[PDB]
Amino acid sequence: MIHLYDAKSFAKLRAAQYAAFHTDAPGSWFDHTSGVLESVEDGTPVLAIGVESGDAIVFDKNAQRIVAYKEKSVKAEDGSVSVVQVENGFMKQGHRGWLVDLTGELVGCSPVVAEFGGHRYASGMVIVTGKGNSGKTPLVHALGEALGGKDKYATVRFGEPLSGYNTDFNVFVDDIARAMLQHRVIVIDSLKNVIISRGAFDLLSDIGAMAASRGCVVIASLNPTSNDDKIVELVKEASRSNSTSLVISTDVDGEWQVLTRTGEGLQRLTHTLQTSYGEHAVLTIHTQTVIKNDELESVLRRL
Amino acid sequence: MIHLYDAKSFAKLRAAQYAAFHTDAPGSWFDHTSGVLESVEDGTPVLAIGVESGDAIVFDKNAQRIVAYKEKSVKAEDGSVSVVQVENGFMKQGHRGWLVDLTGELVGCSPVVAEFGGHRYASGMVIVTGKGNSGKTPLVHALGEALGGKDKYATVRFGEPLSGYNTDFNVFVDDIARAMLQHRVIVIDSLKNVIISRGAFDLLSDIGAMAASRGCVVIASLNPTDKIVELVKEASRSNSTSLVISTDVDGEWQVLTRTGEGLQRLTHTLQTSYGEHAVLTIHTQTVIKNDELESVLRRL
Amino acid sequence: MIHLYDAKSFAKLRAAQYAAFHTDAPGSWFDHTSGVLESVEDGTPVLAIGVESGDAIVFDKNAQRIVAYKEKSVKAEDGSVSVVQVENGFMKQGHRGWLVDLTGELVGCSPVVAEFGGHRYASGMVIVTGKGNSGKTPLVHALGEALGGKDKYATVRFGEPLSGYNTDFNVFVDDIARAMLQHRVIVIDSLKNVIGISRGAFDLLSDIGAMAASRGCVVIASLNPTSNDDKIVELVKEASRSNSTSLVISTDVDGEWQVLTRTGEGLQRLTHTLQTSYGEHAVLTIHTQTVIKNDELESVLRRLT
Amino acid sequence: MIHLYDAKSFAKLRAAQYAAFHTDAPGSWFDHTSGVLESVEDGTPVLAIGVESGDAIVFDKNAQRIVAYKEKSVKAEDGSVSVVQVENGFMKQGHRGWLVDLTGELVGCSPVVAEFGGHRYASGMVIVTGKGNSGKTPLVHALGEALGGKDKYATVRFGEPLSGYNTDFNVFVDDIARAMLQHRVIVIDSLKNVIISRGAFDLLSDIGAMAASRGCVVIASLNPTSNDDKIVELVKEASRSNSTSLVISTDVDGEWQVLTRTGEGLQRLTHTLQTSYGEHAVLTIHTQTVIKNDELESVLRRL
Amino acid sequence: MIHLYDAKSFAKLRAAQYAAFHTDAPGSWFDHTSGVLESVEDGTPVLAIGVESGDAIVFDKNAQRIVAYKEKSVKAEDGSVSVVQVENGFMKQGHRGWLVDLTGELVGCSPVVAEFGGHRYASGMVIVTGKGNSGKTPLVHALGEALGGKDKYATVRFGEPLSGYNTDFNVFVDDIARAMLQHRVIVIDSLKNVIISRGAFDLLSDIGAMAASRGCVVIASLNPTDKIVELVKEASRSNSTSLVISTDVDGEWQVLTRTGEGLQRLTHTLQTSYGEHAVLTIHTQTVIKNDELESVLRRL
Amino acid sequence: MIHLYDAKSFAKLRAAQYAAFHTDAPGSWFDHTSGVLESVEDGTPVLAIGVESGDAIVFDKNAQRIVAYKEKSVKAEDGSVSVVQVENGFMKQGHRGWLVDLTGELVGCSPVVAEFGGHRYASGMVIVTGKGNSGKTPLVHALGEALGGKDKYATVRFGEPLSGYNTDFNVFVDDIARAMLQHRVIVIDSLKNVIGISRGAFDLLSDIGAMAASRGCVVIASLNPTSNDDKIVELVKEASRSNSTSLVISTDVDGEWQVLTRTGEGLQRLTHTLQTSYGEHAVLTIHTQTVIKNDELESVLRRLT
Ligand SMILES: Nc1ncnc2c1ncn2[C@@H]1O[C@H](COP(=O)(O)CP(=O)(O)OP(=O)(O)O)[C@@H](O)[C@H]1O
Ligand SMILES: Nc1ncnc2c1ncn2[C@@H]1O[C@H](COP(=O)(O)CP(=O)(O)OP(=O)(O)O)[C@@H](O)[C@H]1O
Ligand SMILES: Nc1ncnc2c1ncn2[C@@H]1O[C@H](COP(=O)(O)CP(=O)(O)OP(=O)(O)O)[C@@H](O)[C@H]1O
Ligand SMILES: Nc1ncnc2c1ncn2[C@@H]1O[C@H](COP(=O)(O)CP(=O)(O)OP(=O)(O)O)[C@@H](O)[C@H]1O
Ligand SMILES: Nc1ncnc2c1ncn2[C@@H]1O[C@H](COP(=O)(O)CP(=O)(O)OP(=O)(O)O)[C@@H](O)[C@H]1O
Ligand SMILES: Nc1ncnc2c1ncn2[C@@H]1O[C@H](COP(=O)(O)CP(=O)(O)OP(=O)(O)O)[C@@H](O)[C@H]1O
């Protein structure tokens, strides 16, 4: 919905946004949105995600796909009406994203998902990318474990020529929806085959917002392989503006920079990570400064 | 509709256009068009806006979407017939834009929306863009508050990877229609994901006119993040009523304002600074030729 | 239809074409085609114009849109059959353009639409374009008034972020059809969003000049060559060079414009210079025969870069 | 249909092809094909031409469009079957081009259409093009009159912003079909708007063959306007390989080169034309050498 | 179908492939496949070829087009089922190419089609191309006559602005199917208009295999008249069984012949001259590596 | 499905992945997945592969195509539901790839398919490519024989102008499905026409490596990088780099090839050099662990220019 502001109510939002990343307990928002989802009466649609064609599939609170659902109009506070209808396993009426309000007046936030090694990490989508010899796949699994903390992280596998990997986009989005519905920390390996169909474009523009609203983090690997001049800009656009955070490799092997958006129209934070391999290629991450736009664009130009 | 002119009736229009920006009370036009919308008998379509596919959804005066509406033919003054029909939530007959006449003979104007810091600002669409370190999002919220004045401004959020942001274009246009139907000052953050579907092209070409006719202002951020750059330049140059663009110095912005159909564009400079929690404050008439304008556009 | 010629009948056509621009009374052709349209029995389709999709809408002599019309076959002189059918507000059979013969044997002309400041102006489409500081919008309104003369000119507004401007292409073509059906002098502001591409937009660019020249009316359209994208500027150049009957283009000096006029199908293009100035409330006033070769023409077009 | 050859029957074809251009009386072939068309029983389809969509409209011997026609299978000599069917004004079965055999064993010819100023001109399509100040429109009308000789030439008008000009492609092809069905010399002004829809591509590839088979000549103006690098190659391809003859302007105003294909796999002929204007811009053309491929490509590179 | 191999059965295939080009009598394979086609019971589909849309038309052994044919499932040796069905003149089920097995275990061959002037020529598709002043059309007719030998060659004409030339792709493929069904040596003039529709892409990828399986040769002219040049190079390099290309000297041509699946390509030089009425006469084993091959292709 | 991990269960997966390539018996995985397929009750869909249009055809355990199959919902361990439905010979519901779980918790592996000349080779797709004079076709047949070992290898032929070669994409994918369902070692000659693009072709390139690695079979495909068109060579590089489990590429010296093998999802790539020579009738014979970094890998890929 839309929101009205004056100087005073806008100042409050800014303070609340600052708290959502800087002072709230890590994982709080996820726990809150879990409660909201749990309170939804059983069978009610909560999440719609776009399939390859551009149509959408719909899930309930238990991550069960909804095949049929009678038309149902819900009137919001501001007067706006949201209608949801499902027929033959596809969304007839409604929109992509969260079908129940998980956020209320608390919008434009990057809810803190976890704290590791003295740094706070944001929910939403984290893209892991860059060039050089530093491996993406070992990093995303290390990050998934680290941000998981006490909790296990979920792995969605997609589009690699290895055993057990799904390569069908429609199964991929089904896995993602379920992961965001049930887990705080989610790893995607990889985002190469989405990088184009309507579903793929939708996913790139939707997933960051879906995750930030949930309070979960989606850690996606994206190897910038080809040199074709239009596709590299799509990698840069996904890295710059479709991701809540960016994790990018550097000139030195094992070393990564983390760039974190802290909130709608707020300054982006940067910190450096050191890593090393243990037995069987398991990577271990070793244990606040702002960044301007020219520094940001300088980092993007390494891709 | 079409309009006929001779020297005399054209001279009157020019005078009336000049007044609509320079001498009319700020917010007047919005208040007038509010009255026109309020006088529309209940259930009559007033606004149609294009969805992603290129079809259109239709709203009444209360910003309620119309699912069904019997065919209805209205004859204009010039003899042209406008037919409106809605079925299954979509426009069967009609056009995108305002479905009732908000303007009459008063066309080609940039109705003054507000006055702030000694400068008059135009209704229609304002695109906030540019490169460098000056932030777009804090500027649009500061501008929304400033032009709001006594009134609260409306915020439409779209296409950012942050909490509560809608990313579905069809919800986005629903929010916009409602905002223009009910509020004088409107902020859009951001216009990146529209920058391509039929709906997106329609919106870029429609929204400035929709807003200028209403007397409301739509302040939209557009971070120019490689040929599309021309689509950013075209949106900035010719699809926006005003342009707010960053400069070499951080916090400093130039405002370029179209004052009317075939009139000179005005320019003024804004200074800004941040307070607590990254809240931006804007500190408190010269014409610009085309070569100066194109020089400004070439910074994008 | 098609036309047969020998040396003699072709020479007559050339003479008649020369007269249609150089010696006929200004506005004559418009008055003649008005009479032809008026003689059409009521309800008969006269004009079809393409909408955004590429389908066509159809109008009668009174500029009323035709929703339904029984199939009807009309045999021309050369033996060619033109069938017209309309159903559910769209053309089922027929073609875009004039559905009745307004021209007969008199084809390939640029019928003189008006005379102003010692110069004759052609009917058809005039594109007003160019770069520099000289404003397009004030010029088209000044030209509309000047060529209007005793008559008011019609203004079609399209695709600007200002009050009352329609931005829907299908309403735009409805306005244009009505304008050409009822008025000799017509202003379009602006032609940017058609250059911004749909089937209707391509059709309009290729159709409108011929529609207007056949009517004897003039369509004065502004076209600001904004973007530097290398394919779109050629579409501006192509519209200026070959889809317009006349070209009005700005120069290095502010207020000064060159007018390039096609006088007839295989004929030399004429050029003259206009001076202008602003009065009160930004009202522009235009102040009061030489041929041009192709290399001079292409030289003029290369300023649109 | 297909044709079988040995050394001897192939040598005969070559001789017959040589005669069709060099020794046959000018206009002979047209008169012969007129007789063939006249002998077709009334109502039988003779010509199909593609409309904008790529569907085809069909005409009888009198240049009357056929709205409906029962399915009808005709067996050729070699065993090949040609089926023709028309329904709702469009071709259901059949092919684009001539629906009756106008040529028999006499194929690959450029039947002489006329003789003017000591030079023989070929039937088929002549494209008039080039850059510089020499006007295309006055040249095509002068050529139409000259090759017409005793006969009037037909003018098809298309795609110019002048009075009486049709701009609808479907009317354009209707005019062309009628012109080729009834007249030996045909002028098209202009071929700019076809230069893309299926109909336009079809027309460019079809018309030369349609005309050469009829023994009529189609003289089409084509101003090479824009500099866009793919469209100029389409102008070059139409000039080089879709036209039977090419008439192209030179460095000197009023002077034109004519390049004529004399037959399937035969040498191309070249000659120079001088012109001048009389009263009311009427152009007058003033009154055998072979050309190799490198000379031909050199001429094309002026476009 | 698929084939299984070990060292021994693979060695046999290689020997049989070598013989199919180097030692078998010229024209043998054509005569054998003629017998196979003749033994097909009347009305059974034998060949399917793609039309402009990408659908396929189907022919019987007599080169008669099949309008209707009941669904019919044939089980191959490896267990794979081939179903053929035709309805309303188009293939409902099946595949493009030969619908009856003409080859069996004998696959990957270039069956010798003829011997002329001391050189053996392969069946399949021969593309005649190149730049310079040496004419393509006279060469293909000379080659058609020479490889014909005692037999007349068939000429398919397509896409030239000359009398009697068909320009409709669907008639073109009908002519080709009939030619391959009934004749060993076939000339196509020209392959320019196919060089894009689904049918055209299909034909380029299908025809070489169709011809090599039949034991017939398709000699196609292709004048390389700006990126499509790669489509000409790809057709010349990998879609043709043999390549005949002009040289720096007029009348002189190089012939590059694939002798079999994964075998070395052979090269020889041809001299030609014109007689009366532009009739060309061709005057009367060395391997070539890949770098020499790519060097030849770079002249296009 | 999705998998949950902590440090400990992730460490186990890594160890199991290492074993799947380095210590398991060659061909083991194939034999295990054969058993899984054999235990599927008869008539149940096991494999779906995309045809030219982008629709999918479906096969049972015996490599028989399924024309019709009632809707059937199977619930996985994680709660995710997989529905399979076939009608009129095409997949109505389901996904491309394996329709039964062949892998369980054992994912991200490169199951060892064979051992030859002191080197272990991975299952999945091997692309054989490169420039220079070293022949692709003789190499793939030599590799098929060598990795076959005691077993015959299957040959799928596609898109060459030689006798008996199928050129229809829909037959090609039918052959491939059957090959992977019944044989451990599979040769494809060639992969040029799929790079020559339809939905089916794009699907196949992105699907086949995973299909094969999951089965424990190896698909050895030749891919001659012919044309110099700048977008198509990147599609060859992308297929070689990221769509293939292993890469076999020719070198400056004739007969010599480099083999680059992915050992597992987040693991180091291995490299070794092969020498070859021809015997009688052009039969190629291959003569009888070092890791490679990314910059060395990209250096190898840049030879395909
Ligand atoms: N123990 C170890 N030591 C050093 N480097 C290692 C390593 N284990 C893995 N790596 C590196 O990690 C990389 C593997 O991950 P990535 O390259 O980022 C994605 P990928 O597995 O190559 O799939 P892709 O084909 O989609 O790129 C390898 O290039 C390898 O060099
Ligand atoms: N207190 C403060 N002091 C200085 N700069 C600040 C600030 N708060 C925010 N900014 C600047 O404002 C910018 C944020 O606004 P935008 O220009 O719209 C980029 P964004 O919206 O965050 O990402 P996007 O371009 O993907 O939408 C940042 O570049 C940041 O440097
Ligand atoms: N009184 C006056 N004196 C000098 N110049 C004037 C003027 N009134 C108008 N102009 C000039 O006329 C121009 C307006 O016309 P144009 O710029 O050519 C098209 P536009 O109406 O601005 O729409 P566009 O900019 O979206 O294309 C202004 O840029 C201004 O410089
Ligand atoms: N009497 C005359 N003397 C010299 N040149 C003449 C002439 N009459 C006509 N011309 C030339 O002939 C040309 C007109 O024909 P063309 O340019 O070849 C096609 P066009 O009429 O310009 O339509 P186009 O817009 O499609 O190009 C003019 O450029 C003109 O210079
Ligand atoms: N008697 C002769 N002496 C020398 N050259 C001859 C000849 N007869 C024909 N030629 C050459 O053969 C060529 C004709 O064959 P092609 O190379 O196929 C070109 P085309 O088929 O005529 O046009 P196209 O490329 O548009 O198909 C001409 O270039 C001509 O110079
Ligand atoms: N006995 C032998 N000695 C040396 N080289 C041989 C050989 N047998 C085959 N070759 C080489 O192997 C090559 C054949 O394989 P490739 O060229 O790599 C693919 P192809 O089978 O030719 O199909 P393509 O050319 O359409 O891609 C020949 O070019 C030849 O040089």
Long-range Cβ pairs for the range A33-37 (8 Å, 24+) = A33/A102, A33/A213, A33/A214, A33/A215, A36/A100, A36/A102, A37/A61, A37/A100, A37/A102, A37/A181
Q: Where are the alpha helices (DSSP H) in E183-249?
A: 198-214, 229-237
Ligand 5: which of E223, E225, E232, E253 to mutate, most ligand atoms within 8 Å of CB? E223
Domain ranges of chain D: 6-41+104-303, 42-103
Interface contact C103-D157, CB threshold 8 A: no
Interface contact D5-E141, CB threshold 8 A: yes
Helix (H) or strand (E) holding A129: strand A124-129
For the domain bounded by B6-41+104-300, which CATH number is listed? 3.40.50.300
Which ligand is located closest to the Cα atom of residue B281? 2
Q: What is the DSSP string of C251-271?
A: -SSTTEEEEEEE-BTTSPEEE
Q: What is the DSSP string of E72-140?
A: EEEE-TTS-EEEEEEETTEEEES-SEESS-S-TT--SB--EEEEETTEEEESEEEEEE-SSS--HHHHH
Helix (H) or strand (E) holding F256: strand F256-262
**β-strand pairing of C112-116 with A124-129:** unpaired
Please tell me which of the candidates C7, C103, C231 has its beta carbon nearest to residue D163. C103
The answer to whether E241 contacts chain F (CB < 8 Å) is yes
For the domain bounded by C6-41+104-305, which CATH number is listed? 3.40.50.300
Cβ–Cβ < 8 Å for F131, F236: no
Q: Where are the alpha helices (DSSP H) in E215-246?
A: 229-237
Cβ–Cβ < 8 Å for E143, E230: no
Residues 63-92 of E with CB under 8 A from F: 78-81
The ligand 3 atom at the shortest distance from the C-alpha of residue B238 is 26
The owner of tokens 């909201």 is: A36
Q: How far is CA B74 from CA B101, B249, F189, in A?
A: 11, 54, 69
Compute the distance between CA of residue E203 and CA of residue E54 in angstroms, rounded to an integer: 10
Q: How far is CA C19 from CA C126, C209, C264, D206, F272, in A?
A: 20, 20, 10, 39, 87
User: Minimal Cα distance from E221: which residue of D?
Assistant: D265
Compute the distance between CA of residue F260 and CA of residue F100 in angstroms, rounded to an integer: 30
Compute the distance between CA of residue D29 and CA of residue E163 in angstroms, rounded to an integer: 10
CA D16 to ligand 1 centroid distance, Å: 72
CA E92 to chain centre: 25
Strand, helix or coil for residue E12: helix
The ligand 1 atom at the shortest distance from the C-alpha of residue A225 is 27
Compute the distance between CA of residue D270 and CA of residue D288 in angstroms, rounded to an integer: 7
Strand, helix or coil for residue B279: coil
Q: How far is CA F247 from CA F98, F122, F270, F291, in A?
A: 24, 10, 10, 14
Interface contact B183-A4, CB threshold 8 A: yes
- Other Cβ atoms less than 10 A from the Cβ of B196: the count is 10
Domain D42-103 has CATH 2.30.270.20: yes
**β-strand pairing of D97-98 with D47-50:** antiparallel
Residues in chain A with CB shorter than 8 Å from the CB of F15 are: 280
The two tokens of residue E168 are 């409709």
Give the phi and the psi of residue D254 in degrees, each rounded to 5. 90, -15
Interface contact C265-D153, CB threshold 8 A: no
Fold: same for C6-41+104-305 and C42-103: no
Cβ–Cβ < 8 Å for D142, D284: yes
Closest CA to F170 of E106, E97, E66: E97
Span between the terminal Cα atoms of chain F, in Å: 38
Three-class DSSP labels, A169-210: HHHHHHHHHHHHHHCCEEEEECCCCCCCCHHHHHHHHHHHHH
The answer to whether C175 contacts chain B (CB < 8 Å) is yes
On the CB side of B194, CA atoms within 13 Å amount to 30
Helix orientation angle between A28-39 and A198-214, rounded to the nearest 10 degrees: 100
Q: What is the DSSP string of E271-300?
A: EEEE-GGG-EEE---EEE-HHHHHHHHTT-
Q: How far is CA F36 from CA A291, F31, F32, F182, F210, in A?
A: 54, 9, 6, 13, 17
Q: How far is CA D123 from CA A54, D143, E273, in A?
A: 54, 13, 29
Exposed, middle or buried, F290 (CB in 10 Å: 0-12/13-18/19+)? exposed
**β-strand pairing of A185-189 with A217-221:** parallel
Interface contact D237-E225, CB threshold 8 A: yes
Compute the distance between CA of residue A144 and CA of residue A160 in angstroms, rounded to an integer: 19
In units of Å, what resolution does this entry have? 2.4
CB within 8 A of F252, min separation 6: which ones?
F132
Compute the distance between CA of residue C156 and CA of residue C63 in angstroms, rounded to an integer: 15
The owner of tokens 């592969």 is: F49
Compute the distance between CA of residue D205 and CA of residue D201 in angstroms, rounded to an integer: 6
Compute the distance between CA of residue A186 and CA of residue A217 in angstroms, rounded to an integer: 6
CA E289 to ligand 6 centroid distance, Å: 8
CB within 8 A of D254, min separation 6: which ones?
D134, D274, D275, D276
Query: What is the interface size between A and B, counted as CB pairs within 8 Å?
Result: 153
Chains B and A touch (3+ CB pairs under 8 A): yes
- C268-286 exposure pattern, b = at least 16 Cβ within 10 A, e = fewer: bbbbbebebeeeebbbbeb
The answer to whether F193 contacts chain E (CB < 8 Å) is yes
Compute the distance between CA of residue C285 and CA of residue C277 in angstroms, rounded to an integer: 6
Compute the distance between CA of residue F237 and CA of residue A7 in angstroms, rounded to an integer: 55
| Protein residue with least CA distance to atom 25, ligand 6 | E238
Q: Is the dihedral of CA B275, B276, B278, B281 positive or negative?
A: negative
Interface contact B290-C166, CB threshold 8 A: no
The answer to whether C266 contacts chain D (CB < 8 Å) is yes
Compute the distance between CA of residue F249 and CA of residue D212 in angstroms, rounded to an integer: 54
Compute the distance between CA of residue F261 and CA of residue F268 in angstroms, rounded to an integer: 9
Q: How far is CA D76 from CA D79, E49, E177, F126, in A?
A: 5, 21, 16, 53
Compute the distance between CA of residue B136 and CA of residue C78 in angstroms, rounded to an integer: 66
Interface contact A133-F295, CB threshold 8 A: yes
On the CB side of A12, CA atoms within 13 Å amount to 7
Closest CA to A228 of F92, F137, F238, F251: F238
Ligand 5: which of E128, E136, E244 to mutate, most ligand atoms within 8 Å of CB? E136
| Protein residue with least CA distance to atom 6, ligand 3 | B264
Domain A6-41+104-303 has CATH 3.40.50.300: yes
Please tell me what DSSP assigns to residue E25: P
Q: Is the CB of F292 under 6 A from ligand 1?
A: no
Exposed, middle or buried, B104 (CB in 10 Å: 0-12/13-18/19+)? exposed
